[PDB]
Design an enzyme around this catalytic site. Structure first.
Site, PDB file in Angstrom:
ATOM      1  N   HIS A  77      33.061  39.774  23.261  1.00 41.70           N
ATOM      2  CA  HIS A  77      32.560  40.679  23.735  1.00 41.70           C
ATOM      3  C   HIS A  77      30.848  40.056  24.307  1.00 41.70           C
ATOM      4  CE1 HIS A  77      31.797  43.988  27.355  1.00 41.70           C
ATOM      5  NE2 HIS A  77      32.579  44.737  26.322  1.00 41.70           N
ATOM      6  N   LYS A 102      56.915  40.245  39.525  1.00 44.44           N
ATOM      7  CA  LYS A 102      58.315  38.565  39.635  1.00 44.44           C
ATOM      8  C   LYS A 102      58.579  38.053  38.162  1.00 44.44           C
ATOM      9  CE  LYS A 102      57.095  39.352  44.980  1.00 44.44           C
ATOM     10  NZ  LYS A 102      56.642  38.426  46.464  1.00 44.44           N
ATOM     11  N   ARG A 137      32.344  51.074  32.409  1.00 42.06           N
ATOM     12  CA  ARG A 137      31.307  50.625  32.453  1.00 42.06           C
ATOM     13  C   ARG A 137      31.314  48.936  33.095  1.00 42.06           C
ATOM     14  NH1 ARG A 137      30.949  55.046  29.296  1.00 42.06           N
ATOM     15  NH2 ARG A 137      33.015  54.220  29.573  1.00 42.06           N
ATOM     16  N   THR A 138      32.463  48.148  32.006  1.00 40.70           N
ATOM     17  CA  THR A 138      32.106  46.654  32.481  1.00 40.70           C
ATOM     18  C   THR A 138      32.627  46.010  33.756  1.00 40.70           C
ATOM     19  OG1 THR A 138      32.451  45.999  29.801  1.00 40.70           O
ATOM     20  CG2 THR A 138      32.761  44.191  31.331  1.00 40.70           C
ATOM     21  N   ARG A 167      39.188  40.898  31.855  1.00 40.18           N
ATOM     22  CA  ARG A 167      39.042  41.615  30.736  1.00 40.18           C
ATOM     23  C   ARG A 167      40.526  41.405  30.539  1.00 40.18           C
ATOM     24  NH1 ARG A 167      36.803  47.313  29.103  1.00 40.18           N
ATOM     25  NH2 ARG A 167      34.787  46.071  28.353  1.00 40.18           N
TER      26      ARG A 167
HETATM   27  O1  LIG Z   1      35.702  50.346  24.230  1.00 39.24           O
HETATM   28  C1  LIG Z   1      34.956  50.755  23.310  1.00 39.24           C
HETATM   29  O2  LIG Z   1      35.007  51.094  22.681  1.00 39.24           O
HETATM   30  C2  LIG Z   1      33.667  49.505  23.489  1.00 39.24           C
HETATM   31  C3  LIG Z   1      34.180  48.450  24.751  1.00 39.24           C
HETATM   32  N1  LIG Z   1      33.359  49.437  25.553  1.00 39.24           N
HETATM   33  C4  LIG Z   1      32.757  49.049  26.901  1.00 39.24           C
HETATM   34  O3  LIG Z   1      32.804  47.735  27.341  1.00 39.24           O
HETATM   35  C5  LIG Z   1      32.644  49.853  27.947  1.00 39.24           C
HETATM   36  P1  LIG Z   1      33.705  49.739  29.262  1.00 39.24           P
HETATM   37  O4  LIG Z   1      35.679  49.486  28.563  1.00 39.24           O
HETATM   38  O5  LIG Z   1      34.329  51.294  29.948  1.00 39.24           O
HETATM   39  O6  LIG Z   1      33.520  48.865  30.371  1.00 39.24           O
HETATM   40  C6  LIG Z   1      34.797  47.665  24.616  1.00 39.24           C
HETATM   41  O7  LIG Z   1      35.114  46.648  23.658  1.00 39.24           O
HETATM   42  O8  LIG Z   1      35.890  47.576  25.913  1.00 39.24           O
HETATM   43  O1  LIG Z   2      58.443  36.086  46.389  1.00 36.58           O
HETATM   44  C1  LIG Z   2      58.291  34.849  47.088  1.00 36.58           C
HETATM   45  O2  LIG Z   2      59.667  34.217  45.876  1.00 36.58           O
HETATM   46  C2  LIG Z   2      57.969  34.428  47.628  1.00 36.58           C
HETATM   47  C3  LIG Z   2      56.966  34.848  48.239  1.00 36.58           C
HETATM   48  N1  LIG Z   2      55.812  35.429  48.070  1.00 36.58           N
HETATM   49  C4  LIG Z   2      54.063  35.161  48.659  1.00 36.58           C
HETATM   50  O3  LIG Z   2      54.027  35.707  49.321  1.00 36.58           O
HETATM   51  C5  LIG Z   2      53.265  35.630  46.996  1.00 36.58           C
HETATM   52  P1  LIG Z   2      52.414  36.564  46.660  1.00 36.58           P
HETATM   53  O4  LIG Z   2      53.836  37.771  45.648  1.00 36.58           O
HETATM   54  O5  LIG Z   2      52.133  36.262  45.524  1.00 36.58           O
HETATM   55  O6  LIG Z   2      51.809  36.976  47.670  1.00 36.58           O
HETATM   56  C6  LIG Z   2      57.423  36.322  49.342  1.00 36.58           C
HETATM   57  O7  LIG Z   2      58.148  36.533  50.021  1.00 36.58           O
HETATM   58  O8  LIG Z   2      56.821  36.990  49.211  1.00 36.58           O
END
Ligand SMILES: O=C(O)C[C@H](NC(=O)CP(=O)(O)O)C(=O)O
Ligand SMILES: O=C(O)C[C@H](NC(=O)CP(=O)(O)O)C(=O)O
Ligand SMILES: O=C(O)C[C@H](NC(=O)CP(=O)(O)O)C(=O)O
Ligand SMILES: [Ca+2]
Ligand SMILES: [Ca+2]
Lengths: 310, 308, 308
Positions: free
Chosen positions: B134, B84, B54-55, B105
Site C-alpha cells: 500500500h 460480459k 479514504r484512499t 485497488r
Molecule cells: O483496511 C485497513 O484496515 C487498512 C487500509 N485502509 C485504508 O486504506 C483506508 P480505505 O479502505 O478507506 O481506503 C487498507 O489496507 O485498505
Molecule cells: O457487447 C458487445 O459484445 C458489443 C458492444 N460492446 C460495447 O459497446 C463495449 P462496452 O459494453 O464495454 O461499452 C455492445 O453492444 O454493447
C-alpha cells in the site's frame, strides 16, 4: 454580511423567514445570470445512503454549474462503512479533512444533526434524514409557489397522502408557517396523518387548518394542491394496509379548480397523479423539479461564499 | 532531475530513500502553496475492485485540487468484466487508450504489477493489492511522522494488531528501514504475526526488532504507536477465532506516554482504539488521514510532470 | 448551424452519408488539434441501465477532454426508478430539466426512441438499446476503417459471429451500405443469422452480399474482418447451445491475409479471438477502442455547438 455563510443546513425549524427570502432572492439572480466560476477551487462531497434521482442529480449539476468539483457515493455498499464495519461518525470525521462542504441523505432520523458533531468547520447540508426533514426540497417548493402565485402569504394550501412519513411536508408546513395568513387543508388516512408536533406549532401561531376525507370537498378553495407518495419503505408493519395511494387525482377532478391553481408533487409518483393530468395547465411538478437547480445553486453559494452576490 | 516522472508506483521496495524524501518535500510545498492548474488537461482513471472510503476519496479530491478530471468505478459489478466475462488484461488495455494514469485497488496480491504488463506508456499507481503493498498509505504515514516527530531516523515505533495481512505495515516497515537507527516493537496475535520476509529484511540491515504481549509494556518508550484493524476479509477460515481485536487502546493507557508520542491508525478502526482516546493530545489518526491529500497530490504531480 | 446541431442520435437508419462524413472530418480535426474549452459550461447526463466499460468511460473522457461536466449513474438500483417504483418516462422528464444532453444505454429495444418523447428540447444520444442499434459504435468503427484502409468505398468486409442480436452490426451494415461499391460476407450460425430486414435493404440498393461457413473461405479477399461476441444476455435458453463461439480466430489463420487487412471487434471478446492474435500487425481492436475518443468528442461537438 451573509447570514448563511459556513452554516449547517439541517432543519427548516432553524431558519428564519428572512433567511428563506434570502435563498429565494439569490436563486432568482442566478436563474437570470449564471456565475460559472463562483465556486472554482471548491470540492464538495455528495454522500447518499438511500436512493435518489432528483435530489442527487440536481445537487451535483448545481455544483458543476458554479465551477465546483464533486466526490462521493450514491450507495454505501463499497465504502469502508459498508464492508469493514466503520461508524458513520468516523466516516464524517475523515471526509471533513478533504472537502469544503458535505451533502448527505440517510435513512435514519437525526443522522444529519449527528454528522455536525464530527465535521469540525465543514458545513453539513441535509438532503433528507429518514422521515424527519428535507430543507432543500422546501427551498425549491417555496421558489415554485412564489413563481406561480406571485407571493408566499395568504395562500390556501392542501397537502395530500402520507403526511406522517413525508419529510417534504414537515419542512414545507414549518416554512409556510413563518409567513402571514396561510391556511392548510390536510387530506390523509387516519394512520398516516400529519403529526401532532406540526399541528401544535400551527396552533401556537394562530394559523388555520382542517382535516378532510376527500380532495373534491376543498378543490374550489386551493391555490396549491401538494400531492405525495406513500413512503412504502418507512411503513411499520401495523401500517402495511396503507401501502396503496388513498387519493388518486385525475384530469376530470380539476373541473372546479381555480384558474391559477397548480398541482405540485416532490416526486416520484406512483398512481396518486394519473398521467392525463400531465397535459393540463395545472400540472407543475416537472417545472417544480427544474427549479431545484436554482434553489440548490443559491444554497451552495450562500454557504460557501463569504459575500452576498450583488 | 525528476526521477519519478512516468514511473509505475507499485511497491515501497522499488523506491529509494531519496525518492521518498522528494515526495515528502513536494507535499510540504504544495500544502504551503497550492497549484490548482498543475494537471489541467489530464484525465486519470480511478479503478477500485474492492471497498474504500479514504484512499479513493482522497485520491479523487487530490486530482481535482490540481485541476485534473477523473473517470472510473468503485465496484466492478457493472463493467464488461463484471457482466460480459471480460478479462482484467483486456480491461487495462482499453482504459489505457483513454487516460494519462491509472489508480487501482484490487483484492489480489500482484494485480497492480500485472496491470503494468498491459498499460503501455501509462503509469499505474497501486492503491492496495490484497494483503501485499500500500505505497501511498506509506507516503502519507511518513509525512505525518516527519511532521510530528521532526525526523524519520532514530525512532522507537510499535505496530499493533494484524501484521500478517496488513498491507499498510509491510510497506511502512520497508520504508522506515531505509532510514537510520529505527527500532521496532511488534504486538500481534500468534496467528497474525509480521511475515518472515519483513523480519529477514530487518536482520540483514542490522535493525533491531522485538515481540511483545501488550501495548502497556512498550508505552513509555515509543515515539509512534501504529494501531491496525484485523483484516477480517482476508482471514483463512482456520483463523476465524482471531476476528475480534486482541489489543484495545484506551485513554488511560497514555498515562506514561512521552510528550511527543502520537497514536496513528490507517483506518478504519473497529474497537481497537476506544473513542475516549480521540480527545487526547496524542490522537493523530484524523490528522494523518487529512495528510493523504498532500502526499497524493505530490505523487500525482511528480509522476505526470517532467519538471519538478 | 451544422446539420447535426440539437439532433437526437438514435439510429444509423436516420443519418445520411453526408452526416457521417461530417462526424469523420470533425473527428480528424479534433485529433490533430484539440479544443479543451469547446464545451465549457455544458453539463451532460450519462445514464447506463446495463453494463459497459468502453462506451461509458470513453464518452465521459471525451466530455472532460472538451471541458464539459458529467452527472448520472452506471446502474439503476439506487435511483428512484430502482427503489421507489418510478417510470422510465418520469425519469427522463426530470433529468431533461437539468442537462444539455442525455447519453443513454438500456436493455430494451426502442427505449432510446421512447426517451425522445419525454426529453423536450434536450438531445438523446443512444449508447445501445437492447439488440437494436448502436450508432456511436458505428461512428468509431467508420473512423477506424478510414484510418487503416484510406477509404470507406470499394472494400471487402466480413462480419462474423452473432449477427442476429448484435446491435453493432445492424448499425454498421446500414452505414457501410450508404457508401459505394462495398461487398459483404456474413459468417454466422444459422440460429443467429443477419436479420432479413438488413438483407432486404442491401438488395434494394443492389449491394452484393453472401453467406459463408468458414473464415478460411474469404481470408484471402477481406480488407476488414469484424468479429463479434455471442450476446448471451439476449438469447433464449432454448438457444443456449449457441453460447460457445462457433468460429475462433487464431494467429495461424492469417497466413494468406492481405497486408492491409485489419481484425476489428467492438469488444469485449470471450473466446472468438485467441490471444496469439494480439501481437500480429493485423490486430486492431484496441486501437479501434482508442478511436472512440475522437469519434465521441466530434459527435458531442456537433450536437452541442451551433458553429463548426
Ligand atoms: O483496511 C485497513 O484496515 C487498512 C487500509 N485502509 C485504508 O486504506 C483506508 P480505505 O479502505 O478507506 O481506503 C487498507 O489496507 O485498505
Ligand atoms: O457487447 C458487445 O459484445 C458489443 C458492444 N460492446 C460495447 O459497446 C463495449 P462496452 O459494453 O464495454 O461499452 C455492445 O453492444 O454493447
Ligand atoms: O420520496 C418521496 O416520495 C419524496 C422525496 N423525493 C425526493 O427527494 C426526490 P428523489 O428521491 O428522487 O431525490 C423524498 O423524501 O425523498
Ligand atoms: Ca510487490
Ligand atoms: Ca469515394
Amino acid at each position: 454580511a451573509n447570514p448563511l455563510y459556513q452554516k449547517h443546513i439541517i432543519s427548516i425549524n432553524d431558519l428564519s423567514r428572512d433567511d428563506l427570502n434570502l435563498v429565494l432572492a439569490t436563486a432568482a439572480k442566478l436563474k437570470a445570470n449564471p456565475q460559472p466560476e463562483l465556486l472554482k477551487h471548491k470540492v464538495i462531497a455528495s454522500c447518499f445512503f438511500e436512493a435518489s434521482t432528483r435530489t442527487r442529480l440536481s445537487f451535483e449539476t448545481s455544483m458543476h454549474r458554479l465551477g465546483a468539483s464533486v466526490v462521493g457515493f450514491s450507495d454505501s455498499a463499497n465504502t469502508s462503512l459498508g464492508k469493514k464495519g466503520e461508524t458513520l461518525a468516523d466516516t464524517i470525521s475523515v471526509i471533513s479533512t478533504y472537502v469544503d462542504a458535505i451533502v448527505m441523505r440517510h435513512p435514519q432520523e437525526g443522522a444529519a444533526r449527528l454528522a455536525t458533531e464530527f465535521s469540525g468547520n465543514v458545513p453539513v447540508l441535509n438532503a433528507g434524514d429518514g422521515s424527519n426533514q428535507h430543507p432543500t426540497q422546501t427551498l425549491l417548493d417555496l421558489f415554485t409557489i412564489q413563481e406561480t402565485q406571485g407571493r408566499l402569504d395568504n395562500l390556501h394550501v392542501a397537502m395530500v397522502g402520507d403526511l406522517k412519513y413525508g419529510r417534504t411536508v414537515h419542512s414545507l408546513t414549518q416554512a409556510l408557517a413563518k409567513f402571514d395568513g396561510n391556511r392548510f387543508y390536510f387530506i390523509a388516512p387516519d394512520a398516516l396523518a400529519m403529526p401532532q408536533y406540526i399541528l401544535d406549532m400551527l396552533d401556537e401561531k394562530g394559523i388555520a387548518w382542517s382535516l378532510h376525507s376527500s380532495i373534491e370537498e376543498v378543490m374550489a378553495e386551493v391555490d396549491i394542491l401538494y400531492m405525495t407518495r406513500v413512503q412504502k419503505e418507512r411503513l411499520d408493519p401495523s401500517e402495511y394496509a396503507n401501502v396503496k395511494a388513498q387519493f388518486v387525482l385525475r384530469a376530470s377532478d380539476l373541473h372546479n379548480a381555480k384558474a391559477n391553481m397548480k398541482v405540485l408533487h416532490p416526486l416520484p409518483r406512483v398512481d396518486e397523479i394519473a398521467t392525463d393530468v400531465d397535459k393540463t395547465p395545472h400540472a407543475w411538478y416537472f417545472q417544480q423539479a427544474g427549479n431545484g437547480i436554482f434553489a440548490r445553486q443559491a444554497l451552495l453559494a450562500l454557504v460557501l461564499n463569504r459575500d452576498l452576490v450583488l
